[PDB]
Amino acid sequence: GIVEQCCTSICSLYQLENYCN
Amino acid sequence: FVNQHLCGSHLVEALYLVCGERGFFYTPKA
Questions:
Q1: A14 lies within 8 A of chain B by CB
Q2: Which residues are in coiled coils (chain B)?
């Protein structure tokens, strides 16, 4: 989930925007 | 501010800035 993609590995703008409403 | 390790309140803060007025959902155990 988001913790695996952005916390334990390096985040990106592409991935963050997947969680906007 | 987005291309780094973001955890806890630091992650929530990034979602807040990026998503702006459309808001977001935060699910740490999904």
A1: no
A2: none
